[PDB]
Amino acid sequence: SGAIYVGNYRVVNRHLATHNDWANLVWEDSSRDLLVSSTTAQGCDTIARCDCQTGVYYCSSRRKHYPVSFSKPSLIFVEASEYYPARYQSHLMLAVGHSEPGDCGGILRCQHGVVGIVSTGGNGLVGFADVRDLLWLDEE
């Protein structure tokens, strides 16, 4: 679990969104595993606006933050899970690292701010849903 809190927005994995998230929906995209809802209080996270390929992510199954090198956002085939069938997920970046299903939502960040959140995992791979292209998170 985990979310990004920027301005009056809450960014979560679409597959982990709550009823309150759907009832206060701003935007959602199943192909990216992302959902954004509105919040009453202002958040403290800042979104990175960069092309960094190195950063640090939080892994809840190890209570640890790990430095990683990650690929550029791309269209990647992801295997079937309890939340989606096997399909292509867009705007996904891969890295070598530990992940388990419950690690979804952990933040990946670089020197500029939040880059994205954990969305997929494999035997020693972790995938992150990028948010750096969502410029509207910084306004309104």
Ligand X SMILES: CSc1ccccc1CC(=O)N1C[C@H](C)C[C@H](C(N)=O)C1
Q: Which residues are annotated as a binding site?
A: 50, 52, 110, 112
Residue 117 interacting entry, from Zn ion, ligand X, none, C-beta within 5 to 8 Å by type: none
* Residue of 20, 27, 30, 50 interacting with Zn ion (CB under 5 A): 50
Judged by CB under 6 A, the number of residues near ligand X is 18
Minimum CB–partner distance for residue 40 and ligand X (Å): 28
Residues 93-112 that bind Zn ion (CB under 5 A): 110, 112
Per DSSP, the residues of 86-138 read SEEEEEEEEEES---GGGTT-EEEETTEEEEEEEEE-SSEEEEEE-TT-GGGG
Any contact of residue 6 with Zn ion (CB under 5 A)? no
